[PDB]
Amino acid sequence: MSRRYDSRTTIFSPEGRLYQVEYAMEAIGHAGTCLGILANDGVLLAAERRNIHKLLDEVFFSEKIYKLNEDMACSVAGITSDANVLTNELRLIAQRYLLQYQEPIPCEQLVTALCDIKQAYTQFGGKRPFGVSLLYIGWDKHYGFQLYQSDPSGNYGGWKATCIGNNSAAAVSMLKQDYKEGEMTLKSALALAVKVLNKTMDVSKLSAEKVEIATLTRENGKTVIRVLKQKEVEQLIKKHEEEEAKAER
Amino acid sequence: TQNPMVTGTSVLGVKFDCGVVIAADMLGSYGSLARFRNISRIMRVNDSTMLGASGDYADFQYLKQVLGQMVIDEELFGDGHSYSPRAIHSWLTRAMYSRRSKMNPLWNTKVIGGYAGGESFLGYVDMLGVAYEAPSLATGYGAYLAQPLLREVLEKQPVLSQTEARELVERCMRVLYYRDARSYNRFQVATVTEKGVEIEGPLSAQTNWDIAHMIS
Amino acid sequence: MAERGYSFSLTTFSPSGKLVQIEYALAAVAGGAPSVGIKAANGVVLATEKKQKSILYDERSVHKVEPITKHIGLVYSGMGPDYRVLVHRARKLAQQYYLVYQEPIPTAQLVQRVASVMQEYTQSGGVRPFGVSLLICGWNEGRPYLFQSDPSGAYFAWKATAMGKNYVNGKTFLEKRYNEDLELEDAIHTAILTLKESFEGQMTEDNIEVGICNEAGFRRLTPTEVRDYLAAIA
Amino acid sequence: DRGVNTFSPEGRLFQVEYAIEGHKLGSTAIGIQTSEGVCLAVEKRITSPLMEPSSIEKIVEIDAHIGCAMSGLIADAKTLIDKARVETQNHWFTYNETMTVESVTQAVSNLALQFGEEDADPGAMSRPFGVALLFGGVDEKGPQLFHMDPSGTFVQCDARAIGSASEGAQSSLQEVYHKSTTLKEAIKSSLIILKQVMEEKLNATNIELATVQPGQNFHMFTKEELEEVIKDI
Amino acid sequence: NQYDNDVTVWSPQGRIHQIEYAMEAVKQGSATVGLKSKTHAVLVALKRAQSELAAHQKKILHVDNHIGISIAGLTADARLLCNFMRQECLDSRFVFDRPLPVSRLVSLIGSKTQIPTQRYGRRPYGVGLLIAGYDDMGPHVFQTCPSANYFDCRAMSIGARSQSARTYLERHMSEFMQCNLDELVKHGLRALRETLPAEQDLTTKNVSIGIVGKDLEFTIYDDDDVSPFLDGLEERPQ
Amino acid sequence: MSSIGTGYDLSASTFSPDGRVFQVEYAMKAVENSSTAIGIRCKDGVVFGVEKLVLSKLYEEGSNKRLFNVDRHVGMAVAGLLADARSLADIAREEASNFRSNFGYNIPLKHLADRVAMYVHAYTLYSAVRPFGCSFMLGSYSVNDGAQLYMIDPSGVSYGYWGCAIGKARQAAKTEIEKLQMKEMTCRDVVKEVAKIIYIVHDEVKDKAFELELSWVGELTKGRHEIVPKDVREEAEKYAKESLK
Amino acid sequence: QIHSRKMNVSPDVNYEELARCTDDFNGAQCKAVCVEAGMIALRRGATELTHEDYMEGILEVQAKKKANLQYYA
Amino acid sequence: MSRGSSAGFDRHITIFSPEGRLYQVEYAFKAINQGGLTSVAVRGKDCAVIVTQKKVPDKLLDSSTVTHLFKITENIGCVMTGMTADSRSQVQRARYEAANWKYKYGYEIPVDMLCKRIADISQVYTQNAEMRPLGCCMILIGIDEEQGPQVYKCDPAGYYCGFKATAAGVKQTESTSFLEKKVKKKFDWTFEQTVETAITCLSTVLSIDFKPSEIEVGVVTVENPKFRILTEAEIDAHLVALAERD
Amino acid sequence: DRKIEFSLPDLEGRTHIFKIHARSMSVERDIRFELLARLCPNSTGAEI
Amino acid sequence: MSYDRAITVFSPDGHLFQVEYAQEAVKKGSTAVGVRGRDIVVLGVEKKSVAKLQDERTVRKICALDDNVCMAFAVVASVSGLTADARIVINRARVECQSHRLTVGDPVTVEYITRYIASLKQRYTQSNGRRPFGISALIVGFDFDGTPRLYQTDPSGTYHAWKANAIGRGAKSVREFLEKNYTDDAIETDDLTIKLVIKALLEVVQSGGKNIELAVMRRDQPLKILSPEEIEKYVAEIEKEKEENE
């Protein structure tokens, strides 16, 4: 090209290839890292909240990691403003699935329902593209614990370790590298989660004001999802902290 | 074959068509069931400057029709500087409305007689509760159609159109007969004539009496 | 072509990856009246500069600290129309909430629902975002709340923040003076000082309105009541 | 933001002038009217013999007894045909006789210029048809072939050839066919003309032949059936 | 150019160019004569053609078998109104049950043609239509042009080089009312010959004739069914 | 420049730094291209006098459509682009049609003019449809408030007048109306008066050759809007000719 | 009108009628048109400029050319 | 230049300028200066009074028929200030909103609520991509049957603020300043007082002083259960009183 | 006096000029040039 | 906004901008080849974009829309391996196919779904705001008749049947390559049908045959995806014969 034929999504690209999506991917990198690691009794999500400021009202512990359903939770990397419509939408879909199927909703099914809305916005209706990558964490009895990655465009993939945010390229390779398979436990995936989160992020300290950590753990055959509170979060950070400290001068 | 139990009725609308005029007589009385609530009542309306409409049977169903024919006439005159609407389009479109409302089994009949000239021809049209449009020599609808119209038919049978004088004697004969034979009405008639300037027909006044068969 | 079309639209994305539009909306609020909100942790205070100067404002049915429901108030900055629709929808949503649970809505659930709505205008194209930044106060569950909802359609948790004229300077004073847990009466005194930084032309006999939210509930306060606090600390 | 239509200073639509140029790029359609049928002959526009000549949407059915051949933008044509198709099959259900080839032609010419978007209509197009069509079918007065083109010009035709050279396609028709003569020869003439506008020499693979007769009605040809009409080059 | 790309761009004259540019298509398109007596309405048309292996384009169209039109301009826009008008007729007998007045329909189309000239960018319909009709009132020769303005006229001629036809109609303003079905047709040919060069006159194959009036319903005459009407060849000046 | 002819009229979703969009100012120019329509108000009706521009003498009645019948007591004389003239006729008329059905009585002009004026301004707001660009008058005789005359310009401003003229000779014509009397006198005396103003104003740098059309809407025609009779028209015209010379 | 004085005044040209047909032609362009009208007339074996002659002249002078793209032109 | 910036979408379709205020909204205020209608409204305790130029340029116009005082409720009244094209469109819109409300609530409308509600409607016009904000100001008068006389004013975009005394127009800043002195040194109100104070401040700013057939003064008094237009009879009486008053 | 929009040679005009050059040099006669001209868009004399 | 920018403008090209441009995308990312056989019409894909920690069950590059029709695609655009655009098209085309069964029974024919899909992209060219999908799908299947068909659709929405057709990594290149391998013998034999697919894929071989996934589908029967392990058996032997021709 030499000029876009976009300026609306009710008019389209001078190549028919959508530039806006590549700027959206860059948008996840602007925002803080989101990572998901797999465990053999749970799955956990670790995300960097928008708020770093000391003054926090703290009525919410969920401000980027939202528990949607009685089987699944998701996280946001990107603009916070976008999650609010999405999170309420996800709640509707998630319970919608239960009504008909009444099964521990699989991660692949929830993500495909959402991808229908994101692909339409980019095609028509004059709505601006999304700028969030969401990580869905859940349990089904047919493959186990799963992690899925959704992109602004509607592009999806099942992972068991994936990271986006604070330069995606580096982060996904690193998360993989430190990940091990079938050697894991929930406490050690959590200790590791802070460590990797620390390296991708500029900070070498990190606090529960900066970070918000969620578990999804299966107990007595049913999935209990909680986003953890600050004192509990701090304990995972301090566990990591001794190691981080030795790296430093 | 139908006739709803009417509450507020105009019983009779007389009509005979002549050479450039129509003479219509319209019942003054408005029966609301057995009680005659209102006499003053002219059921002939002025739509426009060359049309008139006169209806008998339910008066409510009439008042709903007069405004509707008013909006149809208002659309049509806009197109010319002094164009006026022909009888047939407005009366026929209303016919289709009454055929549909007849099928809906709770409804009330009205039967109207329109006189207009909007063509190159003077049209005398009817829309009925049952619906149909036709020409007629002399016409009467509703309760007229049932009992005087047959007297009119008798006349019409060897002499296709009556004279002015003979129609007046019949009118006078007729009002007696309706008060005597039908209930709701009165003798009282308004004489209304429509011409190319509008409709003129002053307030309903009393005319010849005879509910006596003591003399017979 | 140039940057002009691409960047401004919310019918398609900014090429920056974040929308230049929400940033524009904050500038609007800067041109607005100065507003401070502070959760003491004994109650919440919302205070704003209200233009009387001779008493040119009806204060008998129209205010700048205004109740959404029984125990929730809002104080605002920026564009006036955008806000009025926002109030009326917000109260509507609250009333649906009071109807169902039989409890007036708390600030923390309300901002999130309110944010969903403001996001829709930030998504829709041809439709601009709401150009009001809201300070929501409340006391529900036995705990006072203060939240900030920005024009983007996002909600952020704060114990004390500043909006309106010179917000950068407000946030710096708040962090400096404010301590976790305080008395609601001391809290008004620093709020009147927070306004006083970038008031413009200074307070007359009364040219502020303050509303308090506490245990008994959110109430906007009368010009006389308001004046008593201003003598203590201008 | 902007309009839709733009008139050129010449006094005619810019988009309509472009739409004519649109025709030059594609397939060719020849239809030859005889009182024994209407035949439509069109190329698919070949590039490999792996492309079947057995079943290819270039001659498509508007009705059971009306076939329509397209030239210009092929793809867009299938949408014009679909709209004509719904009107035509409703008329066929009702009449149980024939649906005038002429009406159908008049109906499609409405779709050529109707287009609005950008605060006019979401139900109307953003483009003009750069399709030209030959509707050939059998009717109660007789077998009729009608020509429509991007300007919307509905005209009745005894014989018309339209292709990637409009001047070329007709001029070959002058040489070879004459209005009145057998059914078999009308097909014969379609193929010769078709070869002339086309790059390459005639083969079974390059074309699809469909004849609509009052005697047989629309027949979509398969490969065995194609070899028969090829015999007469 | 710029005004007509949009419509909301208004001119320094104060008149939209999209309408003016639309009028120029009418100048490209076929010459037509439409004349009335006071018993009949006659449409005398010049047919144009793309091939002479194909039958010359029928320029009298059936809207109803009592009103018909002759088109000058964009053909696609014409056909679109043709169908629109046709349905209106069908509607009129369906509900009202009578032959549609020409006068009710020109006004109705005049309301509809205004709407896209006002819609952003959209066309005014670059076609001028001459509706010849005989209804219950008698004959009407109506002009709709690309401007929503319509004329009620006794005789007018629209299309390519029709101006030359219009001058001869002015001389013969008196003759029209007075004329019979035969006579009025010979004047339409006279008017039609002006359009064409002073090198040539009318042939049977480029003339299409449509007659509706008191004598007979709307029948359209094609390629060589024009002939009994046709005979009458008058002056063409240099 | 108080207007730009390219820039700030690219869409109808614009404003301009003075406060008024240029498209509306152009729409006043559109009315200047056509002849004048005058309408002077009595207390027994309104009488219109419009000069109709002619190019042929094969024209018959219902040509140009300078007089429209909005209702059976509302008259309209128009000036400006005839294309635009038909839609404004529809807008006033549809409002009238709904009104007649529901309310069941003759429309007061005080309500109609503001009500219509809202609609005329409403196209200007939208970029779904372009501003109007013909100007019209509403003149009514009713028992609802008497004879009343309003003028609504394509901007969407409605004002009262005893005498309004809209054209390219509106300024010159309005002053001329003020010198004459017609305010209290009958429609029969007035008709003569509407004709003469048109001839005296009639310039050769604002208008072209015309045939006169005048119209009633008052007590003589019994409410309803009709065109004046040919015989009457010619006496009103005969005074109009004499008065110029 | 002024141009018809320059050449000759035919009974055929009618200024009122002519004005309607065409749109947006100015003085200079018009002079070219009258010169063109004359070209047509010389071919005919005429000196008169016919009404049809003026019209035709209009089309040659612009960007437009014989044998148009359009199938109505 | 001027407020806002042409760059990008903000006049093609309504999407915010750098200022964070719509391009059209800032321009929207300028639209009052286009109008030439200069208004001051003063609030009593017995009436709410509005005084405005009626803008009758010639007596060829009928003084009665020309108006800018409208009856928008059952006794709530308003005056229009600014571009007239905007002003009639706002009036008619306000009227719909007014009727619906009266029914629902079931009693006559507070002046405050009516101004608040029109203020919500005007945001709608602002937000929609086809439309553009109104350029006019509606000044509502009415007596709330609790609080007393209230004078409200709505801004072009649909801003709402409370007022007990207001002015709007070309010379908005000057009119509000003359009235500000009068509010401070508040007189006790009666029908006559309130009216005298409204006219006097408007006549200082303009420095012409009104004719008794060129202004329209509109009141909602306790004695009328209707919205009433003062007309030439009443205004003439206050006008001769002004010269003599001080 | 006039403006003429200069347009590329029509289909007959390009066939005719090619024919003239073609005969001069060694070409096989029955030439496929016609099939190619019709297939292709407007082509100028320089081009042929 | 500019004339060129707008979705409406038929362009000197003589064809709508957004339809033209979608057509220039049918090379690069992923590769889909389908050849016709008597007993199985077989499609094969190379590149499911799998790191082999990514689920291969989630990404479908070979999805069965019916119970006798299946399709494989490829396409060009911004951001690699892009599941989304292809995935909406699978969802609407598959439901429509199941809805067709419900309306008018038995497994739906190859040619009908292909007609539906080509028209689906076409209708969008009229529809508001909508450009056509840039996708070419190799619709592979058997009819209810059992007549094998191999169909291909293009981005404008014109469709043609072929005996064998290949797209992606340069559409034109893979089509040309496949034509040397195709023979009338290849269609009759069950071993050769698979190898013909694999033979087009290999000229842009990446990561084994485990990367390459093939399916055979039969006359009325569901999609059978041959193991990622079976595919490898063909590739080792064939790859050697492949080097020689190019």
Nearest CA in chain E to D103: E83
What are the Cα distances from residue B186, in Å, to B203, C7, J41?
15, 83, 92
**Number of other CB atoms surrounding residue D229 within 10 Å:** 20
* Alpha-carbon gap: I35 to the closest alpha carbon of chain D (Å): 5
Distances (CA, A) of F66 to B143, F29, F215: 48, 18, 10
Convert F112-123 to b/e letters by CB count within 10 Å (16 or more is b). Answer: bbbbbbbbbbbb
Tokens 């009454």, residue located: B98
Unique residue bearing structure tokens 């009418």: E26
> Residue C144 corresponds to which tokens in the numbers above?
């006072």
Contact B161/B19 with Cβ under 8 angstroms?
Answer: no
10 Å Cβ neighbour count for G35?
A: 16
Are the Cβ atoms of D120 and E119 closer than 8 angstroms?
A: yes
What is the residue range of D105's domain?
Answer: 1-233
Token pair listed for B112: 């109207």
Backbone angles phi, psi at F90, to 5 degrees: -65, -45
Q: How far apart are CA F189 and CA J65, in angstroms?
A: 85
Rg of chain G over Cα atoms, rounded to whole angstroms, equals: 12
* Burial (0-12, 13-18, 19+ Cβ within 10 Å), H97: middle
Chain H residues with beta carbon closer than 8 angstroms to that of D1: 9, 12-13
Tokens at G14, concatenated: 């009618």
- Of F175, F222, F214, F169, the C-alpha closest to F195 is F214
Q: Maximum CA pair distance of chain F?
A: 54
Inter-axis angle of helices D101-112 and E75-95, nearest 10: 120
Going edge to edge, which strands form the sheet with E150-153? Answer: E61-62, E67-73, E127-134, E139-144, E150-153
Strand partners, B184: none
Q: Could you identify the residue written with the tokens 């990637």?
A: D164
Neighbours of chain B (3+ CB pairs under 8 A): E, F
How is residue J203 annotated by DSSP?
Answer: G
Of A12, B106, C81, E184, the C-alpha closest to J130 is: A12
Tokens of E230: 């046709």
Q: How far apart are CA H142 and CA H99, in angstroms?
A: 16
Residue J188 · residue J148 · CB < 8 Å? no
Up-side HSE of residue J15: CA atoms within 13 Å toward CB? 19
DSSP state, D181?
S
Query: F147 vs chain D: nearest CA distance in angstroms?
Result: 40
Question: Which residues of chain G neighbour F55 with C-beta distances below 8 Å?
Answer: 16-17, 19-20
Interface of B with E (CB under 8 A): 76, 78-80, 83, 86, 88-89, 92-93, 96, 119-121, 133
Give me H71's structure tokens. Answer: 């009856």
Structural domain contains residue F1: no
Give C121 to chain J, closest Cα distance, Å: 19
CATH number, domain of D154, equals 3.60.20.10
* Dist. CA F222–CA F227, nearest whole Å: 13
Q: Contact at 8 Å (CB) between F45 and F216?
A: yes
Reading the block at residue H168, the tokens are 């709007």
Q: CA–CA distance from B172 to each of B138, B146, B187, B193, H111 (Å)?
A: 16, 18, 9, 17, 65
Please tell me the total number of residues recorded for chain B in this structure. 216
- The residues pairing with J161 across neighbouring beta strands, listed in sequence order, are J151
What value, to the nearest 5°, has the Cα angle with vertex C52 and ends C46 and C58?
Answer: 85
Phi-psi region of J52 (alpha: psi -120 to 50; beta: other; left: phi over 0): left
Please calculate the CA angle J72-J77-J82 and round it to the nearest 5 degrees.
55
Residue of H nearest to D119 (CA): H130
For the domain covering A19-247, report its CATH number.
Answer: 3.60.20.10
Q: Do β-strands H215-221 and H47-53 pair in parallel, antiparallel, or remain unpaired?
A: antiparallel
Contact A174, A193 (CB under 8 A): no
What number of H helices and E strands is found in chain D? 6, 9
| Rounded Cα–Cα distance for residues G30 and G36 (Å) | 10
Q: Do B48 and F221 touch (CB under 8 A)?
A: no
Distance, CA of E32 to CA of E155 (rounded, Å): 11
F19: three-class secondary structure by DSSP: coil
Asked whether the beta carbons of residue G61 and residue I3 sit closer than 8 angstroms, the reply is: yes
Residues of E in contact with F20 (CB under 8 A): none
* Cross-strand bridge partners of residue J73: J137
Residue of D23, D59, D126 to mutate when probing chain J, most J C-beta within 10 A: D126
DSSP H or E segment with residue J216: strand J212-217
> CA G33 to CA G59: how far, in whole Å?
9
CA distances from C94 to C72, C75, C102 (A): 10, 16, 11
CB E16 within 8 A of CB F23: no
Cβ of E74 within 8 Å of Cβ of D109? The answer is: no
In the numeric block, which tokens belong to residue J206? 């990446």
Min Cα–Cα distance to chain C from A58, Å: 7
| Shortest alpha-carbon distance between residue B76 and chain E (Å) | 7
Dist CA C40 CA A55 (whole Å):
12
Which of the other chains make 3 or more beta carbon contacts under 8 angstroms with chain A? C, J
In chain G, what residues touch F54 (CB-CB under 8 Å)? 16
- E strand or H helix that includes residue D145: strand D143-148
Domain that holds residue C129: 4-232
Six token digits for residue E36? 């009335």
G21 and E29 within 8 Å at the Cβ level: the answer is: no
Which two tokens mark E111? 């309301």
Helix (H) or strand (E) holding G67: none
Determine whether the interchain pair E122/D9 forms a contact, defined as Cβ–Cβ distance below 8 Å: no
For chain F, the domain total comes to 1
CATH number listed for the domain at residues B1-212: 3.60.20.10
Nearest to I1 among G35, G63, G64 (CB): G35
Q: What are the chain F neighbours of H11 within 8 Å (beta carbons)?
A: 8, 10-11, 13-15
Classified as helix, coil or strand, H52 is strand
D167 to chain H, any CB pair closer than 8 A? The answer is no
Q: How many domains does chain D have?
A: 1
Using a CB-CB distance cutoff of 8 angstroms, which residues of chain D are in contact with residue E28? 11-12
Domains assigned to chain J: 2-239 (3.60.20.10)
* Sheet strands (E) in chain F: 37-41, 45-53, 67-69, 74-80, 134-140, 148-152, 158-160, 163-166, 210-218, 226-227
Q: How far apart are CA E63 and CA E84, in angstroms?
A: 9
Distance of alpha carbon B9 from the chain centroid: 12
Residue type, E199: E
Name, in order, each residue with C-beta under 8 angstroms of B65's C-beta and a sequence gap of 6 or more: B53, B55, B94, B110, B112
Closest chain E residue to G65, measured at CA: E28
Task: Inspect the interface and report whether the beta carbons of F56 and G16 lie closer than 8 Å.
Answer: yes
Distance between CA atoms of residues D42 and J193, nearest Å: 32
All residues of chain E having their beta carbon less than 8 Å from the beta carbon of residue F30 are 14-15
Six token digits for residue A243: 């190691």
The answer for residues whose C-beta is within 8 angstroms of residue C168's C-beta and 6 or more apart is: none
Element containing residue A224 per DSSP (H, E): strand A222-227
Best CA proximity match to B49, nearest among E138, F107, E137, F223: F223
Strands D37-43 and H47-53: unpaired
Topology of the domain comprising H2-245: Glutamine Phosphoribosylpyrophosphate, subunit 1, domain 1 (3.60.20)
Residues 6+ apart with CB under 8 A from B69: B47, B53, B90, B94
Positions of chain breaks in chain A, given as the residue before each break (C to N > 2.5 Å): none
Q: Under the phi-then-psi rule, with left for phi > 0, alpha for psi from -120 to 50, and beta for the rest, what region is D212? A: beta
What does the buried/exposed string (b/e) look like for B141-163 if buried means 16 or more CB atoms within 10 Å of the residue's CB?
bbbbbeebbeebeebeeeeeebe
Domain boundaries, chain H: 2-245
Rounded Cα gap, residues H78 and A182, in angstroms: 77
Are J156 and D73 inside 8 Å of each other by CB?
yes
Rounded Cα gap, residues J228 and J88, in angstroms: 26
- Asked whether J87 and J75 are in contact (CB, 8 A), the reply is no
Contacts of C176 (CB under 8 A, 6+ apart): none
| Domain CATH number, residue F214 | 3.60.20.10
The alpha carbon of residue G15 is apart from the nearest alpha carbon of chain E, in Å, by: 10
**Sequence-ordered list of residues with C-beta below 8 angstroms from that of H110, at least 6 positions apart, any chain:** C61, H142, H144, H150
Length of chain I: 48
Extract the tokens encoding H43. 């609030």
The CB-side HSE value for J18 (13 A sphere, CA atoms) comes to 29
Supply the angle between the helices A186-200 and A230-247 in degrees, to the nearest 10. Answer: 60
Chain G contact present for D16, CB below 8 A: yes
Residues 6+ positions from G42 with CB-CB distance below 8 Å: none
Beta bridge partners of B29: B39
Structure tokens at B79: 């197109």
Q: Locate A105 and state its tokens.
A: 């909703």
Kind and range of the H or E run holding F225: none
Delimit the domains of chain B by residue range: 1-212
d(CA D57, CA D53) in angstroms, rounded, equals 10
- Chain A residues in contact with J49 (beta carbon < 8 A): 157
Q: What is the DSSP letter of F129?
A: B
Residues of D with CB under 8 A from a CB of F: 1-2, 119-120
Taking the C-alpha atoms of residue E128 and residue E158, their distance in angstroms, rounded to an integer, is 7
In chain E, what are the domain boundaries?
A: 1-234
- Spatial distance between the Cα atoms of A33 and A50, rounded to a whole number of angstroms: 11
Residue listed under structure tokens 């006098």: F49
DSSP string covering F33-62: SS--EEEEE-SSEEEEEEEEE-S-SSB-SS
Is D8 an interface residue toward J (CB < 8 Å)?
Answer: no
Helices (H), J64-138: 84-103, 110-123
Closest chain D residue to G68, measured at CA? D17
User: How far, CA to CA in Å, does F3 sit from each of A121, B153, F26, H70, H108?
Assistant: 39, 77, 9, 32, 45
**What CA–CA distance (Å, rounded) separates H196 from E148?**
54
Query: Do the domain assignments include residue F42?
Result: yes
In terms of Cα–Cα distance, which of F77, F78, F73 is closest to F219?
F73
Exposed / middle / buried, residue B20 (Cβ in 10 Å: 0-12, 13-18, 19+): exposed
> Measured between alpha carbons, how far is F187 from F44 in angstroms, rounded to an integer?
7
Instruction: Specify the DSSP class assigned to residue A145.
Output: E
* Pair D22, D130: CB distance under 8 Å: yes
| Beta strand spans in B11-153 (E) | 12-18, 21-27, 29-32, 35-39, 44-48, 51-58, 110-117, 122-127, 138-142
Q: Which residue in the set B49, B75, B82 is minimally distant from F97, CB to CB?
A: B75
Cβ neighbours for C82, distance < 8 A, ≥ 6 positions apart? C130, C131, C132, H123
Q: Which CATH architecture has domain E1-234?
A: 4-Layer Sandwich (3.60)
Q: What SS3 string covers chain E?
A: CHHHHCCCCCCCCCCCHHHHHHHHHHHHCCCEEEEECCCEEEEEEECCCCCCCCCCCCCCEECCCCEEEEEEECHHHHHHHHHHHHHHHHHHHHHCCCCCCHHHHHHHHHHHHHHHHHECCCCCCCEEEEEEEECCCCEEEEEECCCCCEEEECEEEECCCCHHHHHHHHHCCCHHHHCCHHHHHHHHHHHHHCCCCCCCCCCCCCEEEEEEECCCCCEEECCCCCHHHHCCCCCCCC
* The token pair that represents F230 in the structure block: 């040919």
Residue C157: which H helix or E strand, with range? strand C154-157
Look-up of token digits 């109307």: D124
Q: Residue F67: CB partners within 8 Å, gap ≥ 6? A: B81, F48, F50, F75, F76, F77, F78, F213, F215, F225, F227
Q: Of A97, C155, H150, E78, give the one whose Cα is nearest residue D114.
A: E78
Q: How many CB pairs under 8 A join E and G?
A: 71
The pair of structure tokens assigned to C41 is 């942790």
User: Which residue reads 């207390």 in tokens?
Assistant: F43
The residue among E88, E89, E107 with the most chain B CBs within 10 A of its CB, best to mutate, is: E107
Distance to chain C for J209, nearest Cα, Å: 39
Kindly state the tokens that stand for H143. 């007596």
Does D122 lie at the interface with E, CB-CB under 8 angstroms? Answer: no
Q: Which residue has the tokens 């008639």?
A: B189
What one-character-per-residue DSSP string does C92-145 give? HHHHHHHHHHSSPPPHHHHHHHHHHHHHHHHHBSSSPPP-EEEEEEEEETTEEE
**What residues of B act catalytically?**
1
For the beta sheet containing H136-144, the strands, ordered from the edge strand earlier in sequence to the opposite edge, are H69-71, H77-82, H136-144, H148-154, H160-161
**Chain D CA closest to residue J120:** D79
**Which residues in chain D touch residue E55, judged by CB atoms under 8 angstroms apart?**
155-158
Whether D1 and H12 lie within 8 Å, measured CB to CB: yes
Chain-centroid distance of CA E204 in Å reads: 19
Burial of H147 (0-12, 13-18, 19+ CB in 10 A): middle
* Closest by CA position to E232, among listed E195, E204, E208: E204
Q: 3-class SS at G7?
A: coil
Neighbour subunits, E (≥3 Cβ pairs < 8 A): B, D, F, G
Contact across the interface for B81 and F69, Cβ inside 8 Å: yes
Tell me the C-alpha distance between C185 and E20, whole Å.
Answer: 75
Q: Are F149 and F41 in contact (CB under 8 A)?
A: yes
State the resolution, in angstroms. Answer: 12.8
**What count of CB pairs under 8 Å joins F to G?**
8
E23 in contact with G, Cβ within 8 Å: yes
- Amino acid H208 reads I
Q: Which helix (H) or strand (E) holds C169?
A: helix C167-177
Report the candidate in G45, G59, G40, G48 with the shortest Cα–Cα distance to residue G10: G48
Q: How many residues in chain G?
A: 73
Q: Name the amino acid, one letter, at F116.
A: V
